[PDB]
């Protein structure tokens, strides 16, 4: 390390890049995650 | 006698024989798009294309060879070239020791020797001598540009009128002057009124108002719109 | 540039006279007397300057029917200019083609 | 003025002139020569400690921080640390060629290599280095136990050759069984990655192609042979290459009177 | 062979064997070039210096060019053409010494002087040698060795007609 | 697929290209395109010049360059050995160095998908490119 | 008619793009973050 380390969250190998922009009402849904969009 | 053309000074270029060659051995070898290291411009006499003091040195700055360029330039220039002719060779070397040399028309600086019957230094600049060599006039300077073309993919582009100002510059940057410049009166021609030729050629200016806006008018219409 | 340009001392090649009427020793040198100066420097501090090496005949010095052997390729020789009127874009290059 | 052979600068040059381990450990090499220094000085090189002998010849074409310590030395040390009749001795910064360009940018056709395999002798060893470069040979190579290419006698024989006037020379390694059977495989087979081979200039010669080449080369024949050895051993035959042409001379010549005959025209100039 | 300069040892001893090792008759040693009987110059040729086929033609002369009258004293004319070894303004050795068809003469100077002044003033054919760069040059013992081995017997060049 | 797919990917910022398991990498551009997407074209062409310098003993002419007169924004198509195609997203403001990280990541997953599908493995190793890039030191 | 051959014609300044690993980017960034401060603390003196 070098100073206060903050690791930005990561995903699986395949679900990492180009996640599907598939929502439910104002919520980004996915089989693994959920996040108000 | 006989004037070579009834359109006087029209002569767009040389005869259709040397020009096919002037596009042939001055053909620009297209880039392999690589990444150059250094561009070089040497001064080789086309006959004895030999490893000169810097030509062999700089080539050998890299573990490269000197003769392979030479002979492949020598034998390529064994025919089609006159004797005792020197040439500017623009060399483009790449990162992988890849190189593709062009061959440039012999430019103006050491050209006047064949034009004004003189030599280097005797054409000293305005600070050195103050006098200069044999005079020039406003056709002797037009013909010399016909041999210099940075544009071989476009022979007539740009037309002579835009670059002709250049050659007459360095020769005047070396002090040599034209009768059409630096002077009080222009060329005296005893075939007619020695004086009225000024007012006799003011209309010769006009046939080129229609042409200046026509030679460049076919430029942009030879390109995308 | 040092080398790479053609250097030699031939002479000219004339096919005929710029006029039809040739002058004599005096008129060739009558107009020659004018050719011993120039306007080198064109500003408020405008001055004179010397010239030398003025030829014998400035009429057919290089004006017309005159050729200069300056060709690089073997199948070529000196080129000539015979006529006068359709100067290629040249008349506009008569007075402004100088450091005014 | 240093009239003592125990001076640090003196003992510096000795262990820089004759010893070879504590040479590279400081990256220095002794150069002797009145004009041989300016020759190197011309192409941007300044001696660290230029020791002039205390005397008359004092040219100062680079003085005033010529990488100073322009020391004046006694005649006595002019004899000891300096085997050499110069009153003008110094030392320079070791350059280096990269051991990878033997392995990758092996250019195809005009690739003729030298090897020089034996326990060699300075003067001769230096001479070949001058002439091999003298024809723009590429990849001049070392062996099991040749003399260091920066030795003081070698640089006196090379006479301005060692430094990169035009010299892609190279030096090779030490291997396991007190031998160099692994010196070749690591590179030499890869120096048949580019194709042809020869083993001339050995006191004993076998196949002996013997200076008989007719065709001007079929000029586009992108393969080209390599260098040679000094003594008589079949070590050059245990390597994979099946080429075996051991060349000799014609007339009553002897050692060292064979190579400069061979390398003269056995070099790149097969164009003739 | 000839060695025309204010030469040095033993860069001739290794050269006064190429006359022997390649069967030359004798050697014009242009003394006072250097030592010629020296215990090193003879040792630099490993005893083959004092060979039966090489009597040491030690020549005392100067730049008077009367030495070309000595060249004429050396087995007359119609035997020895020009010999000079110069820098690389000259053609080649596989240009001049490829076109013998005749008989000529061999001569190898040292670096600092070349030959005595009046040696190039009488000559129709000097001899160059290839080089790495322009101002770079090669030895005095590496001069003749390429040329004492081209004028050895010239049997390949016969087969090199084409 | 014989085994469950991988779930962790190497963090190597890829600045090389290769055919670790690709089969064809085409690009489409437009010379008619002059103003619209000056940089959009400036990337696609650049990715070609940075793709022809790929890293494996293949002939680097696995890469193609097409001149579409369609006047469409330049689009890249990469197809892998087994056949699937990956169309990288050429958004406003994405340069060559970005794309090589895009594909070479989707080319590690494609490799580990193929290595899961029973396809043979072409393991990258030291050949002429870990050299000739070691001299750049 | 052109330059040297062997291998393949790479072009594109092959001498570059050394493909930094994980530990290099974690270092090439933290080193660059130290310069943002080392360019700020310098402005705090001026």
Tab-separated table of C-alpha atoms in Angstrom, chain B residues 60 63-65 67 71 97, chain D residues 107 110 136 164 168 268 271:
chain	number	residue	atom	x	y	z
B	60	UNK	CA	26.710	3.125	-39.944
B	63	UNK	CA	25.022	-1.082	-37.539
B	64	UNK	CA	23.381	-0.751	-40.959
B	65	UNK	CA	25.148	-0.849	-44.327
B	67	UNK	CA	26.617	0.212	-50.091
B	71	UNK	CA	24.276	0.301	-55.397
B	97	UNK	CA	15.858	-0.238	-39.461
D	107	UNK	CA	19.111	-9.652	-40.791
D	110	UNK	CA	24.319	-9.582	-45.720
D	136	UNK	CA	31.666	-3.568	-41.523
D	164	UNK	CA	31.780	2.460	-31.874
D	168	UNK	CA	28.743	-4.318	-33.427
D	268	UNK	CA	30.272	-9.450	-47.819
D	271	UNK	CA	29.051	-9.109	-55.522
